[PDB]
């Protein structure tokens, strides 16, 4: 049900954030891309 | 005219930000250092 990002050689699930991932292109080009939510750690810091 | 940062093996220009670069030293030591503007993605989030 949930999506995580792990190191390749050892299972260690982390919450998918903007500090784990980078942005390039859009979803109309990558084959097999999946919808999910990426957590932004700066948003609740701004809100609080 | 403009300055970008790209991976060395494939031309893919990106906006020079504090997440693409690291700070060390000052302008008076590096030979050939060039003036430019480094974008900070946190400033417009703080301002908005
Ligand atoms: C991922 O979400 C996007 C929208 O956030 C979905 O794209 C939509 O597709 C439906 C049906 O084709 C359209 O009614 C919407 O107008 C589309 N929105 C956009 C922004 O394109 C996409 O289908 C979702 N991906 C999957 C496979 O679930
Ligand atoms: C980069 O911009 C700085 C200004 O922020 C320039 O530094 C000035 O240049 C001359 C002296 O070299 C005078 O305007 C000031 O005394 C300098 N300021 C400081 C604090 O160094 C610098 O010359 C510019 N570099 C280039 C090549 O344009
Ligand atoms: C994987 O292959 C199946 C066919 O067995 C297809 O239905 C599915 O869309 C494919 N998914 C991706 C990400 O290529
Ligand atoms: C590069 O070479 C030119 C001569 O063609 C010289 O004017 C310039 O100062 C040099 N710059 C550096 C950083 O060595």
UniProtKB/Swiss-Prot annotation, chains A, B:
Glycans are attached at residue 35. It comes from the Viruses. Subunit of the fusion protein that is processed upon entry into the host cell. Mediates fusion of the virion and cellular membranes by functioning as a class I viral fusion protein. Contains a viral fusion peptide that is unmasked after S2 cleavage. This cleavage can occur at the cell membrane by host TMPRSS2 or during endocytosis by host CSTL. In either case, this triggers an extensive and irreversible conformational change that leads to fusion of the viral envelope with the cellular cytoplasmic membrane, releasing viral genomic RNA into the host cell cytoplasm. This is Spike protein S2'. The chain holds residues 1100 to 1147 of 1273 of the full protein.
């Amino acid at each position: 049900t949930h999506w995580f990002v792990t190191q390749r050689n050892f299972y260690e699930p982390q919450i998918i954030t903007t500090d784990n991932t980078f942005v390039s292109g859009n979803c109309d080009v990558v084959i097999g891309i999946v919808n999910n939510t990426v957590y932004d750690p700066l948003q609740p810091e701004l809100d609080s």
